[PDB]
């Protein structure tokens, strides 16, 4: 997703 820092790298 675009402008998402999630945790699942």
């Given amino acids: ?3 998402v ?3 699942r790298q």
């Fill in 1 to 3: 997703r675009p402008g």
């Fill in 5 to 7: 820092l999630s945790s």
